């Protein structure tokens, strides 16, 4: 006995039962394998900025509490 | 397929530079009677039960791959390289 071998009848009714879902729209993505020699420099820039910020905040704390 | 017997290429062992190599062909080598698998099989085959393992019979391929053996001439370390399967292979012949 033979049988059917293909149809996509009823497939987009099943697709629309729970709608067509969408991507998530995040704010950041991972830079794992992207352009190097540019993100290593960025790591250095951010370390310098953080050093300056923390030193100013710590100095302000030191004089405020005396 | 015609491949010359010498070749100047990168050496990955002990001197990270292009040096002069010799090229030959790799061969299997004979199974040794004291390896662990062969000892296990030879013990399993004794006794009163006939054959104990499968024996392949449905052969399909007619060629083999042509892995080459390279050897640095400054250091004496070696390395393997695979080529596509072919039917006729020559190691140093008359040029076109």
């Amino acid at each position: 006995a033979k049988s059917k071998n293909h149809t996509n009848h009823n497939q987009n009714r099943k697709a629309h039962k729970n709608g067509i879902k969408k991507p998530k729209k995040h704010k950041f993505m991972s830079r794992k394998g992207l352009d190097p020699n540019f993100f290593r420099n960025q790591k250095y820039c951010l370390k310098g900025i953080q050093k300056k910020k923390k030193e100013l905040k710590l100095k302000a704390k030191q004089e405020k509490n005396n | 397929v015609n491949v010359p017997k010498t070749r100047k290429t990168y050496c990955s062992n002990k001197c990270k530079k292009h040096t002069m190599h010799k090229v030959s062909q790799y061969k299997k080598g004979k199974e040794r009677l004291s390896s662990l698998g062969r000892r296990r099989y030879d013990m399993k085959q004794k006794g009163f039960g006939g054959q104990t393992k499968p024996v392949f019979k449905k052969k399909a391929k007619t060629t083999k791959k042509i892995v080459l053996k390279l050897e640095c001439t400054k250091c004496k370390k070696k390395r393997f390289q695979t080529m596509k399967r072919c039917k006729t292979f020559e190691m140093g012949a008359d040029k076109k």
Binding site: Q11, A15, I20, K22, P23, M29, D35 | -
Partner: protein, 156 residues
């Protein structure tokens, strides 16, 4: 048997137009790109390196990576009940700066001065676009000698 190759079914898609063969111009190599830009993927068959896949010919996305001669693009694709983000890596000849955005940019720039002027005179400004609507009444002058009468035609 079945034949689903990488370039199957692209006989007319990937062919040059009439009297327009040959490689690209030299100014194509001076185009500027930046992160987050909108871009169109149009395959150019006379450059065989880094061609896109069949599906993506004619789609639009955003840039997430720039290299020596390549660009990464984020593109949506429908799979059977959802939409997936695809990461497409193509070479620079198959890339074109998208024009889908320009009306919004011109609108912003032009509306800036109207807002600045209206607030400078302290007026009330409306800047949203207007949908075409119903038409008002008017008085149309027409000499009687200019109206031509018609009627259905006989068969021939």
């Amino acid at each position: 048997g079945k034949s689903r190759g990488k370039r199957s079914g692209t006989r007319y898609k990937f062919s040059k137009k009439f009297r327009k063969h040959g490689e690209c111009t030299a100014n194509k190599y001076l185009e500027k790109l930046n992160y987050g830009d909108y871009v169109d993927i149009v395959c150019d068959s006379t450059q065989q390196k880094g061609m896109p896949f069949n599906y993506y010919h004619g789609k639009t996305g955003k840039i997430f990576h720039i290299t020596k001669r390549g660009v990464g693009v984020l593109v949506n694709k429908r799979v059977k009940h959802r939409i997936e983000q695809k990461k497409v890596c193509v070479r620079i000849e198959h890339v074109r700066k998208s024009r889908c955005n320009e009306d919004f940019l011109l609108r912003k720039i032009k509306n800036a001065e109207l807002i600045k002027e209206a607030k400078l005179k302290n007026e009330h400004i409306n800047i949203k676009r207007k949908t075409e609507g119903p038409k008002p009444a008017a008085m149309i002058k027409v000499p009687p000698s200019k109206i031509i009468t018609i009627e259905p035609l006989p068969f021939y």
